[PDB]
Amino acid sequence: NRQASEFIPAQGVDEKTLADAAQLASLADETPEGRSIVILAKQRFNLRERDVQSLHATFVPFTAQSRMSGINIDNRMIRKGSVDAIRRHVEANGGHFPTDVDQKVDQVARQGATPLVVVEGSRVLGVIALKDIVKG
C-alpha cells in the first residue's frame, strides 16, 4: 500500500523525462503503486500518459521473478523495477546507472520509501521514490 511521491532523474536525464518513462514503464503494472506512479508523473511534473496505441508498442506486465515491469515502443524502450532488478537490467543492456541516483534510491529507503528505478535504452533515466500513506 505505497504511493509514488517524488522522483529524481538519473544523471543525463531531466526529472520530467524520468516521469514520462516512469509512466509508460508503469502502464501495465498491476501493483497498487503502478497507479500511484502514473499519477506521480501527472501531479508532480507533467499530466501525461502513454502512447503505445499510436506507435503499436507492447506493455510488459510486472513479474515477481524479476520484481519489475516496463514497456517497449517504437520510440522508447523503458522499464521500471526495484533498484536491484533495474540495475542488473542496465548492466545486461550494456548500459550503466548513475551512482548519485542509486544513492538517492538508498535515501528513499532510509526514509521508509520504495525507490523504483526506471531506465530508457540501457541507462537509468531516474528513480521514483514512493512513500507510505496513512488511511483515515
Swiss-Prot record:
Residues given in the record as ATP binding sites: 29, 33, 62-69, 80
Domain of life: Bacteria
UniProt-annotated location(s): Cell inner membrane
Cystine crosslinks: none
Induction line: Transcriptionally regulated by the KdpD/KdpE two-component regulatory system.
Effect of residue 80 to A: Strong decrease in ATPase activity
Description of how the protein assembles with itself and partners: The system is composed of three essential subunits: KdpA, KdpB and KdpC. The complex also contains KdpF, a small non-essential subunit. The KdpFABC complex exists as a dimer above concentrations of 30-50 nM, whereas the complex exists as a functional monomer at lower concentrations.
Family from the record: Belongs to the cation transport ATPase (P-type) (TC 3.A.3) family. Type IA subfamily.
Task performed by this protein: Part of the high-affinity ATP-driven potassium transport (or Kdp) system, which catalyzes the hydrolysis of ATP coupled with the electrogenic transport of potassium into the cytoplasm. This subunit is responsible for energy coupling to the transport system and for the release of the potassium ions to the cytoplasm.
UniProt note: domains: A protein-embedded tunnel connects the potassium ion in KdpA to a water molecule at the canonical cation site in the transmembrane domain of KdpB. The structures suggest a translocation pathway for potassium via two inter-subunit half-channels along KdpA and KdpB, integrating KdpB directly in the transport process. The periplasmic potassium ion probably enters the selectivity filter of KdpA, travels through the water-filled tunnel to reach KdpB, and is released to the cytoplasm by KdpB. KdpB undergoes conformational changes, whereas KdpA, KdpC and KdpF remain static.
The name this protein goes by in its record: Potassium-transporting ATPase ATP-binding subunit
Species, as recorded: Escherichia coli (strain K12)
